[PDB]
Amino acid sequence: VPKVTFTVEKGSNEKHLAVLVKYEGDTMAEVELREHGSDEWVAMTKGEGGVWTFDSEEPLQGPFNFRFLTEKGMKNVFDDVVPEKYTIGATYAP
Amino acid sequence: VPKVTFTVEKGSNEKHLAVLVKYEGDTMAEVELREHGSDEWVAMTKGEGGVWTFDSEEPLQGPFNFRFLTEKGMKNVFDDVVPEKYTIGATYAP
Numbered sequence A, B: 001v002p003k004v005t006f007t008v009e010k011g012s013n014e015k016h017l018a019v020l021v022k023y024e025g026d027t028m029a030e031v032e033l034r035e036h037g038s039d040e041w042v043a044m045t046k047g048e049g050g051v052w053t054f055d056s057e058e059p060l061q062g063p064f065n066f067r068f069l070t071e072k073g074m075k076n077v078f079d080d081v082v083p084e085k086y087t088i089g090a091t092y093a094p
Helices: none
Strands: A004-008 A016-023 A028-034 A051-055 A064-070 A075-082 B004-008 B016-023 B028-034 B051-055 B064-070 B075-082
Touching: A004 A075, A016 A028, A016 A064, A028 A051, A028 B028, B004 B075, B016 B028, B016 B064, B028 B051
Parallel strands: none
Antiparallel strands: A004 A016, A016 A051, A028 A064, A064 A075, B004 B016, B016 B051, B028 B064, B064 B075
């Protein structure tokens, strides 16, 4: 079974993305997002229960790339993990 | 003496900022920058020896705000620490 998963949450739309991130055996310290066509890693906001969110004034363009840091020291980049046309409630894994 | 300091490095200009960050007794895991007038925390790139850099296509507008995460678990935000008109080689502390 995949060690890192990204589950899209209800409420996600063009200007709001909420993602439940899970790394087996560790917890997220910081999660950053890079939308398709962007060269910048922008910090996501830590929500409750492992959910991380991002609010934008312009439309968000996928596929989405995530970069994170865990509390035990892991740092990783996962490219195009969440597709442009994602489905609410589905789990994505690299 | 200040516990956290930000020293501006040679080479820093309108499109390139290099900052030596130091937190006594800890080491930086991630350092993010928010320029004046921005609502986004963008990740800086880890250089050698504690220096963190940021390259932009448009001019960088200070004062600069920094948000960081240390290897031992500290997370902090320091607003307007580096002024718009900074001097190369000078140390800034909150």
